Amino acid sequence: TQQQAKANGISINYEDRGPADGIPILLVNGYTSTMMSWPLELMDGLKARGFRVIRYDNRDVGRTEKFKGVPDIGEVVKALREGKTPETPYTLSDMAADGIGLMDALGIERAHVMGISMGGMIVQAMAINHPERLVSVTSIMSTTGNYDLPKASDEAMAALQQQPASHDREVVIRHRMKARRVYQSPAFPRSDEALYALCATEFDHMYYPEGASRQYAAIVGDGSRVERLKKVRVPFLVIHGKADPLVPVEGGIDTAKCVPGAKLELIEGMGHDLPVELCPRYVDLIAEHALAAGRKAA
């Protein structure tokens, strides 16, 4: 089930869910999230529509290779405001090359890709840097990095950045539950038991808080993709929750405005999560987008 492949020079833990002749779709996780965070209803729904789902741990999370260095965000932001290219252990482009490298390791020529949050930024970078490898792109609860966009609420930013008090399992899990409630979907909240199970499964997959600073530096260091995205010609779908307090909906709207011809779906009552109740709609949106894209000229 869980296999480890050399891709883009690093060891990537992944799962190819099959079937082998299915339409390949690579799923890219958000900041600090492991491949174990995807809802079963999303993966099963995609499989029931003929999609071969490939999920994987990004660098610095889960059971994929880990890197070194503690980047200072203030130094990165200073380089950007000076108009320079910031120095970080790795970039968003490197993380995009990881996913493309996994396609190479699986013998896949072109794939559909979908990414959530930071994963949405990664699939944007895939579209900018490797368009000849992509059939379609879906960017969910993500943003362009545009500086003029409304900021996240301070409560949501605090939920994203603050570390638990200690390494104790129940301390960490309960802390992560509390953080997820801050940016959950108001119309489709999870039960405490479901939220505990999700957070526990991720914790037990791998607890690696040291990796967060390096992923965050890659996010910040990439700046704005608005100008690059205007050159993207691969079919693009943007999904965003209207009630997202962590990545305000304007960031998804901005993504759709930049990529010419992008499709935009804004979901009422949806926050910064993938409620099981909305998974049939996500599946329908992704499947029809991918099927139509697969009929178009590359």
Coordinates of C-alpha atoms in Angstrom, one line a residue:
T1 CA 0.0 0.0 0.0
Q2 CA 2.6 2.6 1.1
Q3 CA 5.7 2.4 -1.1
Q4 CA 8.7 4.6 -1.2
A5 CA 10.2 5.8 -4.6
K6 CA 13.2 7.8 -5.5
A7 CA 11.8 10.9 -7.2
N8 CA 13.5 14.3 -8.0
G9 CA 16.5 13.0 -6.1
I10 CA 14.6 12.4 -2.9
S11 CA 12.7 9.6 -1.3
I12 CA 8.9 10.1 -1.6
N13 CA 6.4 8.0 0.3
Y14 CA 3.3 7.5 -1.8
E15 CA 0.3 5.3 -2.5
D16 CA -1.0 4.4 -6.0
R17 CA -4.6 3.5 -5.4
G18 CA -5.3 2.1 -8.8
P19 CA -6.7 0.9 -11.1
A20 CA -3.7 0.8 -13.4
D21 CA -5.8 1.9 -16.5
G22 CA -7.6 4.6 -14.6
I23 CA -7.2 8.3 -15.4
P24 CA -4.2 9.4 -13.3
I25 CA -4.7 12.2 -10.8
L26 CA -2.0 13.3 -8.4
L27 CA -3.2 14.8 -5.1
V28 CA -1.0 17.3 -3.3
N29 CA -1.4 18.1 0.4
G30 CA -1.3 21.4 2.2
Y31 CA 1.1 22.9 4.8
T32 CA 2.3 20.2 7.3
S33 CA -0.3 17.8 6.1
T34 CA 0.4 14.2 5.3
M35 CA -1.1 12.0 2.6
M36 CA -3.3 10.5 5.3
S37 CA -5.4 13.6 5.5
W38 CA -7.5 13.0 2.4
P39 CA -11.2 12.1 3.0
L40 CA -12.1 8.5 2.0
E41 CA -15.2 9.8 0.3
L42 CA -13.1 11.9 -2.0
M43 CA -10.7 9.2 -3.0
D44 CA -13.4 6.5 -3.3
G45 CA -15.6 8.8 -5.3
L46 CA -12.8 9.6 -7.7
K47 CA -12.0 5.9 -8.0
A48 CA -15.7 5.1 -8.7
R49 CA -15.5 7.5 -11.7
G50 CA -12.4 5.8 -13.2
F51 CA -9.7 8.0 -11.7
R52 CA -6.4 6.4 -10.5
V53 CA -5.6 8.4 -7.4
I54 CA -2.0 8.9 -6.4
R55 CA -1.3 10.5 -3.1
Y56 CA 2.0 11.2 -1.4
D57 CA 3.8 12.8 1.5
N58 CA 5.4 16.1 0.5
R59 CA 9.0 16.7 1.5
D60 CA 9.4 17.4 5.2
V61 CA 6.2 15.6 6.3
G62 CA 5.0 12.0 6.8
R63 CA 7.4 9.4 5.6
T64 CA 9.0 11.3 2.8
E65 CA 12.6 12.5 3.1
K66 CA 13.3 15.4 5.5
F67 CA 15.6 18.4 5.0
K68 CA 17.7 20.7 7.1
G69 CA 17.8 24.4 8.2
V70 CA 15.5 26.7 10.1
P71 CA 14.7 29.6 7.8
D72 CA 13.8 33.0 9.2
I73 CA 10.6 34.2 7.6
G74 CA 11.5 37.8 8.4
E75 CA 14.7 37.4 6.3
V76 CA 12.7 35.9 3.4
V77 CA 10.1 38.7 3.6
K78 CA 12.9 41.3 3.7
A79 CA 14.4 39.9 0.5
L80 CA 11.0 40.0 -1.3
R81 CA 10.4 43.6 -0.2
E82 CA 13.9 44.5 -1.5
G83 CA 12.8 43.0 -4.8
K84 CA 15.4 40.2 -4.5
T85 CA 15.1 36.4 -4.8
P86 CA 15.0 34.9 -1.3
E87 CA 17.3 32.1 -0.2
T88 CA 15.5 29.1 1.4
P89 CA 16.4 25.4 1.8
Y90 CA 14.0 24.6 -1.1
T91 CA 11.4 26.4 -3.1
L92 CA 7.8 25.7 -4.2
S93 CA 9.3 24.9 -7.6
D94 CA 11.3 22.1 -6.0
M95 CA 8.1 20.8 -4.3
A96 CA 6.4 20.8 -7.7
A97 CA 9.3 18.9 -9.2
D98 CA 8.9 16.3 -6.5
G99 CA 5.3 15.5 -7.7
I100 CA 6.4 15.5 -11.3
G101 CA 9.3 13.2 -10.4
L102 CA 6.8 10.8 -8.8
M103 CA 4.9 10.7 -12.1
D104 CA 8.2 9.8 -13.7
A105 CA 8.8 7.1 -11.2
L106 CA 5.4 5.6 -12.0
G107 CA 5.9 5.8 -15.8
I108 CA 3.1 8.4 -16.3
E109 CA 3.5 10.9 -19.1
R110 CA 0.7 13.4 -18.3
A111 CA -1.6 13.5 -15.3
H112 CA -4.3 15.6 -13.8
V113 CA -3.3 17.2 -10.6
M114 CA -5.2 18.6 -7.6
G115 CA -3.8 20.4 -4.6
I116 CA -5.3 21.9 -1.5
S117 CA -4.0 25.0 0.2
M118 CA -0.1 24.9 -0.1
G119 CA -0.8 22.0 -2.4
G120 CA -2.8 24.4 -4.5
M121 CA 0.3 26.6 -4.8
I122 CA 2.4 23.6 -5.7
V123 CA 0.0 22.6 -8.5
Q124 CA 0.1 26.2 -9.7
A125 CA 3.9 25.9 -9.9
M126 CA 3.5 22.6 -11.7
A127 CA 1.3 24.4 -14.3
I128 CA 3.9 27.2 -14.6
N129 CA 7.0 25.0 -14.8
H130 CA 5.9 21.7 -16.3
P131 CA 2.7 22.4 -18.4
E132 CA 3.6 19.6 -20.9
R133 CA 3.1 17.1 -18.1
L134 CA -0.4 18.2 -17.1
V135 CA -3.8 17.4 -18.5
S136 CA -5.7 19.6 -16.0
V137 CA -5.1 21.4 -12.7
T138 CA -7.5 21.8 -9.7
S139 CA -6.5 24.4 -7.1
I140 CA -8.5 24.2 -3.9
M141 CA -8.7 26.6 -0.9
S142 CA -5.5 28.3 -2.2
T143 CA -4.2 31.6 -3.4
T144 CA -1.9 33.3 -5.9
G145 CA 0.3 34.9 -3.3
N146 CA -0.9 38.3 -4.5
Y147 CA 0.0 40.9 -1.8
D148 CA -3.1 43.0 -2.1
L149 CA -5.4 40.2 -1.0
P150 CA -7.2 40.4 2.4
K151 CA -5.3 38.8 5.2
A152 CA -6.4 35.8 7.2
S153 CA -8.0 36.6 10.5
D154 CA -5.5 36.8 13.4
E155 CA -7.3 33.9 15.0
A156 CA -6.8 31.7 11.9
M157 CA -3.2 32.7 11.5
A158 CA -2.5 31.9 15.1
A159 CA -4.2 28.5 14.6
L160 CA -1.9 27.9 11.7
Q161 CA 1.4 29.0 13.2
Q162 CA 1.3 28.1 16.9
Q163 CA 2.9 24.9 18.0
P164 CA 1.5 22.7 20.8
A165 CA 2.9 23.0 24.3
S166 CA 4.7 19.7 24.2
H167 CA 5.3 16.5 22.3
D168 CA 2.6 14.5 24.3
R169 CA 0.3 12.7 21.9
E170 CA -3.0 13.8 23.5
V171 CA -1.7 17.3 23.9
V172 CA -0.8 17.5 20.2
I173 CA -4.0 15.9 19.0
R174 CA -6.3 18.0 21.1
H175 CA -4.3 21.1 20.1
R176 CA -4.7 20.2 16.4
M177 CA -8.4 19.6 16.8
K178 CA -8.8 23.0 18.4
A179 CA -6.9 24.6 15.5
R180 CA -9.0 22.9 12.8
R181 CA -12.2 24.2 14.5
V182 CA -11.0 27.7 13.9
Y183 CA -11.0 27.4 10.1
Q184 CA -13.6 24.6 9.7
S185 CA -16.7 24.8 7.5
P186 CA -19.5 26.4 9.6
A187 CA -22.2 24.6 7.6
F188 CA -20.5 21.1 7.7
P189 CA -18.6 20.7 11.0
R190 CA -17.0 17.4 12.0
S191 CA -17.8 15.6 15.2
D192 CA -15.2 15.4 17.9
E193 CA -14.7 11.7 17.4
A194 CA -14.2 12.2 13.6
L195 CA -11.8 15.1 14.2
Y196 CA -9.9 13.1 16.8
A197 CA -9.5 10.1 14.5
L198 CA -8.2 12.4 11.6
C199 CA -5.7 14.2 13.8
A200 CA -4.5 10.9 15.5
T201 CA -4.0 9.1 12.2
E202 CA -1.8 12.0 11.0
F203 CA 0.1 12.1 14.3
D204 CA 0.8 8.4 14.2
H205 CA 1.8 8.5 10.6
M206 CA 4.6 10.9 11.5
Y207 CA 4.9 13.8 14.0
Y208 CA 7.5 16.1 12.5
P209 CA 7.1 19.7 13.7
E210 CA 10.6 20.6 12.6
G211 CA 9.6 20.4 8.9
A212 CA 7.0 23.3 9.2
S213 CA 9.5 26.2 9.1
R214 CA 10.9 25.0 5.8
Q215 CA 7.6 24.5 4.1
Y216 CA 6.5 27.9 5.2
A217 CA 9.6 29.5 3.9
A218 CA 8.9 27.9 0.5
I219 CA 5.4 29.3 0.5
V220 CA 6.5 32.9 1.5
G221 CA 9.5 32.9 -0.7
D222 CA 7.5 32.2 -3.9
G223 CA 5.9 35.7 -3.8
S224 CA 3.0 36.3 -6.2
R225 CA 2.2 33.9 -9.1
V226 CA -0.3 36.2 -10.7
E227 CA 2.0 37.2 -13.6
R228 CA 3.2 33.6 -14.2
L229 CA -0.3 32.2 -14.0
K230 CA -1.5 34.5 -16.8
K231 CA 0.7 32.4 -19.2
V232 CA -0.8 29.1 -18.1
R233 CA -2.7 27.3 -20.9
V234 CA -3.6 24.0 -19.1
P235 CA -7.3 23.7 -18.2
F236 CA -7.7 25.0 -14.7
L237 CA -10.4 24.5 -12.0
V238 CA -10.5 26.6 -8.8
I239 CA -12.6 25.5 -5.8
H240 CA -12.9 27.7 -2.7
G241 CA -15.1 27.9 0.4
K242 CA -16.9 31.2 0.9
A243 CA -16.4 31.0 4.6
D244 CA -12.7 30.2 4.7
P245 CA -11.1 32.4 7.4
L246 CA -7.5 31.0 6.8
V247 CA -7.3 31.5 3.0
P248 CA -9.9 34.2 2.3
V249 CA -12.1 33.4 -0.7
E250 CA -10.6 36.3 -2.6
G251 CA -7.4 34.2 -3.1
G252 CA -9.4 31.6 -5.0
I253 CA -11.2 34.3 -7.0
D254 CA -7.8 35.8 -7.8
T255 CA -6.5 32.4 -9.0
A256 CA -9.4 32.1 -11.4
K257 CA -9.0 35.7 -12.6
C258 CA -5.3 35.1 -13.5
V259 CA -5.4 31.8 -15.4
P260 CA -7.3 32.6 -18.7
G261 CA -10.3 30.3 -19.1
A262 CA -10.3 29.0 -15.5
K263 CA -13.4 27.6 -14.0
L264 CA -14.4 28.9 -10.6
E265 CA -16.6 27.2 -8.0
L266 CA -17.3 28.9 -4.7
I267 CA -19.0 26.8 -2.1
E268 CA -21.4 28.3 0.3
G269 CA -20.9 27.4 4.0
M270 CA -17.5 25.8 3.3
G271 CA -14.4 26.7 5.3
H272 CA -10.8 25.5 5.1
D273 CA -11.5 21.8 5.0
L274 CA -13.1 19.0 2.9
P275 CA -16.4 18.0 4.6
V276 CA -17.6 14.5 3.8
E277 CA -21.0 16.1 2.9
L278 CA -19.3 18.1 0.1
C279 CA -17.2 15.3 -1.3
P280 CA -19.7 14.2 -3.9
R281 CA -19.8 17.7 -5.2
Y282 CA -15.9 17.9 -5.3
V283 CA -15.8 14.6 -7.1
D284 CA -18.4 15.7 -9.7
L285 CA -16.6 19.0 -10.3
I286 CA -13.2 17.4 -10.6
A287 CA -14.3 14.5 -12.8
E288 CA -16.2 16.6 -15.3
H289 CA -13.3 19.1 -15.4
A290 CA -10.8 16.4 -15.9
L291 CA -12.8 14.5 -18.5
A292 CA -13.4 17.7 -20.6
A293 CA -9.7 18.6 -20.3
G294 CA -8.7 15.1 -21.5
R295 CA -10.6 15.8 -24.8
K296 CA -8.7 19.0 -25.5
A297 CA -5.4 19.7 -27.3
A298 CA -2.5 19.4 -25.0

